[PDB]
Amino acid sequence: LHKEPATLIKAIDGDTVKLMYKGQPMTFRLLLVDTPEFNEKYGPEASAFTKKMVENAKKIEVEFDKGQRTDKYGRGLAYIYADGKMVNEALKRQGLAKVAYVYKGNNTHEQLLRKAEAQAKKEKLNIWS
């Protein structure tokens, strides 16, 4: 697994972000993550979290896993890093996402993100409160 560069076009919600990738606008869905919808409990906190993290980054990198790169809606499937920090993980860590949509072949960071989740779940952060 390697990082590829991209530039923010637009924050969307807690687990989607519109990015410029290899010259094309592409909506990315975050691997292994499920944030609440913007109108559920902690949805706006999730959107705000991802938004701030992508908006402040000097460098946004896209990292595909070893499986499918595009979902059935045409969304890129990737781990996204904001100045070297993984948005996917930080959401788990902050208690603003649950680990979800784990398909074998696209799961390199499962343990890591479940670790973050475990610690968020320990502290009773946000959705675990």
Ligand SMILES: Cc1cn([C@H]2C[C@@H](OP(=O)(O)O)[C@H](COP(=O)(O)O)O2)c(=O)[nH]c1=O
């Ligand atoms: C995260 C992820 C989502 N998806 C698809 C499955 C969709 O299920 P449905 O067929 O039930 O819509 C899901 C919805 O994600 P959202 O959480 O963005 O709504 O997006 C994948 O196919 N692979 C993935 O890795």
Ligand SMILES: [Ca+2]
């Ligand atoms: Ca969601």
